Design a protein around this ligand. Structure first.
Ligand SMILES: Nc1ncnc2c1ncn2[C@@H]1O[C@H](COP(=O)(O)OP(=O)(O)OP(=O)(O)O)[C@@H](O)[C@H]1O
Ligand SMILES: Nc1ncnc2c1ncn2[C@@H]1O[C@H](COP(=O)(O)OP(=O)(O)OP(=O)(O)O)[C@@H](O)[C@H]1O
Ligand SMILES: [Mg+2]
Ligand SMILES: [Mg+2]
Length: 1203
């Protein structure tokens, strides 16, 4: 072991069958008033996701491969895995039923006979009391054993199924196509559903075993009454199956409706920096409110039928028995003299066992659709590393007339591709936005669908993507990627990528936290980190997807001359490019167009055959609470919309119902104390009719109260969620930067499952229990008020026990809820990088971390239920001992105590006891469960808030955007409130109608002049004004729409391109077509049947960045803002299209004030003025002509060094 004793799996002597191992933790629970992480007794090797998972996998694979897998019914999840553990429960249920039935029924009759004439004997009670004690002890022990077995056996199934699902998730999928938000919802919600169905769905078998016993007892006491019970039970059978059939469809529709809502919830989380400038927070709010309203309506419709089956009529049996008694009544019956109320009380006690059937049937019906869903997840294509084609030696990559394109129902893009690569050679492709030299790179990975051709490959890859993927670990761990530390190789890597000043500028040291996805670094730094990791990993084959795009000229030249030329000269490097500056030193160049290779060979041969591109080459052109749950959460919960009125109506209805049932009980009790037939006999029929109509009322009343309660609780939940969403949406940027996303999404997946499912039932049950107890104590105080002595000791000991167990219950629940968020964080952050993870073949480490996190989360689940079972056992034992003592008292005190004042003693007692036993358990249950509302309230207004959309008090005149005067003055920022300054002493004065180009060294600042305008930075020093009007005083909502920005990284939401094009439908139909046509996409849209309703998702995955950039250009063209700024709009674009692009930009915004950003000097030479910055400061600047004839100018030096 060496970790924890875990006394469950040993100590076979009389120490572990009863719940006694938890007495050790009860001391520590109240000694410190807490329970930390070091004394939780983590799970042993028995309940570990390493032994059961293998067995489940083997069983499922065998059941798949035995015959053709058409559907397989997924019967092996439940019926064959947890089978042997259910036979013991189903065989102990019969024992406990018989023990609870046979004993008391005869004992009460014998005690009544003894209280009739005690004067006969005195020692005849000892056998009776001994039998009573034996039966009670046997019953309680059997019940505790059954619950313990089911609780223990309900965990392993979920523990194995979760890891099976994740292991299936980690596979090569060409596209998601699964509404990614669904996958997370599959991991959490369906985890819970597979648990309850294994721990509750086992008491359904307890119905018939007692029904047959009741029928045979009735036929043995009365002759011809053995036929009506069977007839009235046959009619009861199909109602349950009808209920299940009706609820299955409702559950399926509800889960389908809630599938989509959580997907749109993820889109804002990972794109908040994008939709924070165009005030697109309005459409999404309306869309999510509409889908939430639809979900709430269907949930209410589903739940209305349930409230009618929480025991609307378990009195069918008593109604049938009363009808049989009244109809057959021959005015005396010649048999009913002493045991009149005994049989009625026994039959009333029968409802306790069968009151739990609806819960079992509902859980089974839900588990059916859960099984269907999990079956739907499997039976999909495992397309990865399958080619089934021969290879050849002395080569690494070989192709033979491949014909590939994105997704099986789309027009082919590549046809008849054939190429070869020699070992240790450098090859460049080059081309346009046509042939698409990104499908070729991904073809050999295995992510590309295949139709024909032949692909062969043998080796290892160090993949680099066009974008960047950065984990949450520290920088040194990111560079190492799970490798052994070194000193010489690490220093060589750091010196070979020109990374030294970047590491020196860090505040503390190299070891620093990065973030969720490298949100604290620029694009160039992320590219450099990815390149350094690929360089240090030391793999056989290097694949670079344009690693020299966003970076400058000098650093790129140095890296190519130092790293690629020398440090990587002993391996094979294959990379594509759009710039022909470095193609001189390359070995071979292969040119392909429109998916077809035209000419290939030595680069020196591409001079006279076709000088197409040569014209370009010619010259220049959390925290866990440490206290008890206060009443503030309850006050907030009841202060929801329509709270007090609904609560008062519900309480009044409940009080009236309890009064009615009390009056009926008194009526039947009085009727019991009457003549034994053959006297005063017509009134019986009238009384039966009165009783029948009374029941009716109660029923009607119970239906009404259920309806009202369901409506009120659902309204409260909807209002709470609607309040929460706006607060999360207006969260400042720093909160999103520090706190990971897995800490926010949890409150939207797990809390909403428990608040809207389990809470109302427990609340209503506790309310009913407390009103019944108060009525019983009032009645006891009413008649026979001379017995009010034991009440004090009873209440004080019960309070002592409750205050003893509540500490453990609360601490265990809090520790259970705390440790579930890193789970979701990891499962979210390990999906987006499927390509890189598959390339590096690093699934095992992620899987092991997943398993360890799952076990840590599952550790405190068992003890939470074990504590409640232990409390129930203690309460039952105490009550049994007290009633035994009171009965023995009776026994002894049977000579000089009249029976008139003692006949009802055992009666009222058993009720009182039972009522207290139920009350304590219900109170503990609700106190445990009411922590989710507090957890949601943890994000109350104490959290930071974004900035005030507007103000509506000092809005500027509508004619404000007239001049583009900008006056920068001392703009110094920190970006983290702790990090050192990134830009210092920035002051500019730009006259209206001016053009300025941006170019400079990597790192440093570029984009440098971003922020401090449309700013959300919490400016501390300096201030700027636009057109003579300050920026701090004016509101944000109006100001953000005045100017427009084209982001460097394209962003494309789901739905359609139109919705992005018009946030509010303020443009006609021809203007958008003209805008799309003007930028040379005449055939880029008409190629599809949809014209303006294109299906775009997942950041435009159909067409690559070459088209996403121009889509964003077209979108920003129609806005026509006062100031339109382009942030490096020529990242990956050809040279021929450049002119057209800049010509269109100049034609459109001829007089607008703009600041152009580009990575190429030759494409910025036309600007009126230029400026450059070295590290954090701007050097002297003027027109390009002035600085061109200046040897001592950095701009001329870098232009000359650009070659
Ligand atoms: N989101 C961020 N959070 C915190 N610090 C940041 C963030 N972005 C940049 N920095 C830091 O601010 C300083 C200036 O970087 P800046 O963003 O201006 O670079 P850049 O000009 O965009 O770079 P590149 O040319 O590589 O794209 C650097 O120290 C950088 O690490
Ligand atoms: N991420 C994607 N997922 C699915 N299909 C894609 C994706 N990107 C592009 N497509 C489809 O495949 C075709 C080929 O585009 P490809 O990705 O090869 O472009 P590219 O030339 O490399 O891009 P760029 O010029 O923007 O750098 C597109 O016209 C489109 O039909
Ligand atoms: Mg690419
Ligand atoms: Mg930038």
């Amino acid at each position: 072991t060496s970790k924890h004793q875990h006394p469950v799996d040993n100590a076979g002597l009389f120490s572990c069958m009863t719940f006694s191992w938890l007495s050790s933790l009860a001391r520590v629970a109240h000694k410190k008033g807490e329970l930390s992480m070091e004394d939780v007794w983590s799970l042993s090797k028995h309940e570990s996701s390493d032994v059961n998972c293998r067995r489940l996998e083997r069983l499922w694979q065998e059941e798949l491969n035995e015959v053709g897998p058409d559907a397989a019914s997924l019967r092996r999840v439940v019926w064959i895995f947890c089978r042997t553990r259910l036979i013991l429960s189903i065989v102990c249920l019969m024992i406990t039923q018989l023990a609870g039935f046979s004993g008391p029924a005869f004992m009460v009759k014998h005690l009544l006979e003894y209280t009739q004439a005690t004067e006969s004997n005195l020692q005849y009670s000892l056998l009776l009391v001994l039998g009573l004690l034996l039966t009670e002890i046997v019953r309680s022990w059997s019940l505790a054993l059954t619950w313990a077995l089911n609780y223990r056996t309900g965990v392993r199934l979920r523990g194995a199924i979760l890891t099976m699902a994740f292991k299936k998730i980690l596979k090569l999928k060409n596209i998601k196509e699964k509404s990614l938000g669904e996958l997370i919802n599959i991991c959490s919600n369906d985890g819970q559903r597979m648990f309850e169905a294994a721990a509750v769905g086992s008491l359904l078998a307890g119905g018939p075993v007692v029904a047959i016993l009741g029928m045979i007892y009735n036929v043995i006491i009365l002759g011809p009454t053995g036929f009506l019970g069977s007839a009235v039970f046959i009619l009861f059978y199909p109602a349950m199956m009808f209920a299940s059939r009706l609820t299955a469809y409702f559950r399926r529709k509800c889960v389908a409706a809630t599938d989509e809502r959580v997907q749109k919830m993820n889109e804002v989380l990972t794109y908040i920096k994008f939709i924070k400038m165009y005030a697109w927070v309005k459409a999404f709010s309306q869309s999510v409110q509409k889908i939430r309203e639809e979900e709430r309506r269907i949930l209410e419709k589903a739940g209305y039928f349930q409230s009618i089956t929480v025991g609307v009529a378990p009195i069918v049996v008593v109604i049938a028995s009363v009808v049989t008694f009244s109809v057959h009544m021959t005015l005396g019956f010649d048999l009913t003299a002493a045991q009149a109320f005994t049989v009625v009380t026994v039959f009333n006690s029968m409802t306790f066992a069968l009151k739990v059937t609806p819960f079992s049937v509902k859980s089974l019906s839900e588990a059916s659709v859960a099984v269907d869903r999990f079956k739907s997840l499997f039976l999909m294509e495992e397309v990865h590393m399958i080619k089934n084609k021969p290879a050849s030696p002395h080569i690494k990559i070989e192709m033979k007339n491949a014909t590939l394109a994105w997704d099986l129902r789309l027009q082919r893009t590549l046809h008849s591709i054939d190429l070869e690569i020699q070992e240790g050679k450098l090859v460049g492709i080059c081309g346009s936005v046509g042939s698409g030299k990104t499908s070729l790179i991904s073809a050999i990975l295995g992510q590309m669908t295949l139709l024909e051709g032949s692909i062969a490959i043998s080796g290892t890859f160090a993949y680099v993507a066009q974008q960047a993927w950065i984990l949450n670990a520290t920088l040194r761990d990111n560079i190492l990627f799970g490798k052994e530390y070194d000193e010489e190789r690490y220093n060589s890597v750091l010196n070979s990528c020109c990374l030294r000043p970047d590491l020196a500028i860090l505040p503390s040291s190299d070891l620093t936290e990065i973030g969720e996805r490298g949100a604290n670094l620029s694009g160039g730094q992320r590219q450099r980190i990815s390149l350094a990791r690929a360089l240090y990993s030391d793999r056989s084959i290097y694949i670079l997807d344009d690693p020299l795009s966003a970076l400058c000229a000098h650093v790129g030249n140095h890296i190519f001359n130092s790293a690629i030329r020398k440090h990587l000269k002993s391996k094979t490097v294959l990379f594509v490019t759009h710039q022909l500056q470095y193609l001189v030193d390359c070995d071979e160049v292969i040119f392909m167009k429109e998916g077809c290779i035209t000419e290939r060979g030595t680069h020196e041969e591409l001079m006279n055959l076709n000088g197409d591109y040569a014209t370009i080459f010619n010259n220049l052109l959390e925290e866990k609470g440490q206290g008890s749950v206060p009443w503030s959460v309850y006050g907030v919960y009841i202060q929801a919309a329509g709270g007090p009125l609904a609560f008062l109506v519900i309480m009044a209805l409940f009080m009236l119902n309890v009064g009615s049932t009390a009056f009926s009980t008194w009526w039947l009790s009085y009727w019991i104390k009457q003549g034994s037939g053959n006297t005063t006999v017509p009134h019986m029929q009238y009384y039966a009719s009165i009783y029948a109509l009374s029941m009716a009322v109660m029923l009607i009343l119970k239906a009404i109260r259920g309806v009202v309660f369901v409506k009120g609780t659902l309204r409260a939940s909807s209002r709470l969620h609607d309040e929460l969403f706006r607060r999360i949406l207006r969260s400042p940027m720093k909160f999103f930067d520090t706190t990971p996303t897995g800490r926010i999404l949890n409150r939207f997946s797990k809390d909403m499952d428990e608040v809207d499912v389990r809470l109302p039932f427990q609340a209503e049950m506790f309310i009913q229990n407390v009103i019944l107890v108060f009525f019983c104590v009032g009645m006891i105080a009413g008649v026979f008020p001379w017995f009010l002595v034991a009440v004090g000791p009873l209440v004080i000991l019960f309070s002592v026990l409750h205050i003893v167990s509540r500490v453990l219950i609360r601490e265990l629940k809090r520790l259970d809820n705390i440790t579930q968020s890193p789970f979701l964080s990891h499962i979210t952050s390990s999906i987006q990088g499927l390509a890189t993870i598959h390339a590096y073949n690093k699934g095992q480490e992620f899987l092991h971390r997943y398993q360890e996190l799952l076990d840590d989360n599952q550790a405190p689940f068992f003890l939470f239920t074990c504590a409640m079972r232990w409390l129930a056992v203690r309460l039952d034992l105490i009550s049994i001992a007290l009633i035994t003592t009171t009965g023995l008292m009776i026994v002894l005190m049977h000579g000089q105590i009249p029976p008139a004042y003692a006949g009802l003693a055992i009666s009222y007692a058993v009720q009182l006891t039972g009522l207290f036993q139920f009350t304590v358990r219900l109170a503990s249950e609700t106190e445990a469960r009411f922590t989710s509302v507090e957890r949601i309230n943890h994000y109350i207004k104490t959290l930071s808030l974004e900035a005030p959309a507007r103000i509506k008090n000092k809005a500027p005149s509508p004619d404000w955007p007239q001049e583009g005067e900008v006056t920068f003055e001392n703009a110094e920022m920190r970006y983290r409130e702790n990090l050192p300054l990134v830009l210092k002493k920035v002051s500019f004065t730009i006259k209206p109608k001016e053009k300025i180009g941006i170019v400079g060294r990597t790192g440093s600042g570029k984009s440098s002049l971003g922020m401090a305008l449309f700013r959300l930075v919490e400016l501390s020093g300096g201030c700027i004004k636009i057109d003579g009007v300050r920026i701090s005083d004016i509101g944000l909502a109006d100001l953000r729409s005045k100017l427009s920005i084209i982001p460097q990284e394209p962003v494309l939401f789901s739905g359609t391109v139109r919705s992005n094009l018009d946030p509010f439908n303020q443009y006609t139909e021809d203007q958008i077509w003209d805008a799309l046509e003007r930028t040379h996409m005449k055939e880029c849209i008409a190629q599809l049947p949809l014209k303006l309703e294109s299906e775009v998702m997942e950041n435009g995955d159909n067409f690559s960045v070459g088209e996403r950039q121009l889509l964003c250009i077209a979108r920003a063209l129609l806005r026509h803002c006062k100031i339109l700024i382009l942030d490096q709009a020529t990242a990956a674009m050809d040279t021929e299209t450049d002119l057209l692009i800049q010509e269109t930009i100049r034609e459109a915004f001829a007089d607008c004030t703009m600041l152009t950003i580009a990575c190429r000097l030759h494409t910025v030479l036309g600007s009126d003025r230029i400026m450059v910055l070295a590290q954090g400061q701007v050097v002297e600047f003027d027109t390009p002509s002035v600085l061109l004839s200046n040897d001592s100018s950095r701009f001329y030096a870098m232009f000359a060094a650009a070659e």
